[PDB]
Each structure stands twice: as structure tokens, then as C-alpha cells.
């Protein structure tokens, strides 16, 4: 499963954060800072795969804001990238032309979508349309 998933900007600002492992607040902040420094100090030809703390630190940002994942060494690396791409596509479909400004303003919506997509670090919605329909129905509740 994914221990922690966080979306951070290129400048270092964090736009998303979702950790499935209970860690101390100071320890969590230190881990996030170390992850940001490693991602911020990595080139574009590093394969987007880092083995930090025995965790598959996979970093793949399609825009100025990047995303990071931390999964155990028990599954293939391509699965994490495919899940990240599917989540990005689902978020773009739910929002529509998602930008950095909309992510900050839509932090609650992004968190709800992430919760409805993956819970506890494991994939919960394999389909792409069923999850979107469920998110729309939940939003329409009020």
C-alpha cells in the first residue's frame, strides 16, 4: 500500500498531503521536508524512482506542482505510476482544466476525491466513471 502521498509544488509549497501511516507531527514534518529536498534536488533523468527509507519514493510531476508516493517494496513500480496517472486524469475530469490555483482553492474537493479513490494506501476505485459518478452524487448531497 501507499504509506504517504503528497502533492508539492516546484517552489516547495505543498498542495496535497495524505499519509496512511501514523507518524509524529515533528517526524512527519521532517519526513516531508526530506522528501521535498530529495525531489527538489533530483534531475529529470533519475527515472522518477527513489529508494528512500526502504520505501518506493516515486516522483512524477506533469506540471509545476509535483506528486510523490511512498509504497513498500512488494509491488511493481509501474503500478504506482499508472495509479498516479489515473488519479490525475480523474481529478482533471472532475474539475476541468485543473491548475495550481484551483488546487489550493479546491483542497477539500481534492481530499474528498483522493479519499473516494484510494483508502488506506490501497486502490479502492478501479473504474474511472463509477468513481466520478459517486463523487458527483456525494457532492450533490450538500
Amino acid at each position: 500500500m501507499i504509506h504517504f502521498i503528497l502533492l508539492f509544488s516546484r517552489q516547495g509549497k505543498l498542495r496535497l498531503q495524505k499519509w496512511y501511516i501514523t507518524l509524529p507531527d515533528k517526524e512527519r514534518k521532517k519526513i516531508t521536508r526530506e522528501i521535498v529536498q530529495i525531489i527538489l534536488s533530483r534531475g529529470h533523468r533519475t527515472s522518477s524512482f527513489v529508494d528512500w527509507k526502504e520505501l518506493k519514493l516515486v516522483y512524477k510531476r506533469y506540471a509545476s506542482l509535483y506528486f510523490c508516493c511512498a509504497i513498500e517494496n512488494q509491488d511493481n513500480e509501474l503500478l504506482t505510476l499508472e495509479i498516479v496517472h489515473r488519479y490525475v486524469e480523474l481529478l482533471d475530469k472532475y474539475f476541468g482544466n485543473v491548475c495550481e490555483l484551483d488546487i489550493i482553492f479546491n483542497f477539500e474537493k481534492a481530499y474528498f476525491i483522493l479519499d473516494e479513490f484510494i483508502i488506506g494506501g490501497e486502490i479502492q476505485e478501479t473504474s474511472k466513471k463509477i468513481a466520478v459518478k459517486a463523487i458527483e452524487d456525494s457532492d450533490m448531497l450538500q
Binding site: 501514523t22 479519499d115 473516494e116 483508502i119 488506506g120 456525494s138 448531497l141
Partner: peptide, 17 residues
Amino acid sequence: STQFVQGLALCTLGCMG
């Protein structure tokens, strides 16, 4: 009875087990 409330509670329990 609500499905969104039950699903949200289950997701919260799973995330903060």
C-alpha cells in the same frame, strides 16, 4: 442509512485505524 456518511466513516476508520 446514508451511503455517503457510511462510506466516509469507513474511509476514516481505514485511514486512522
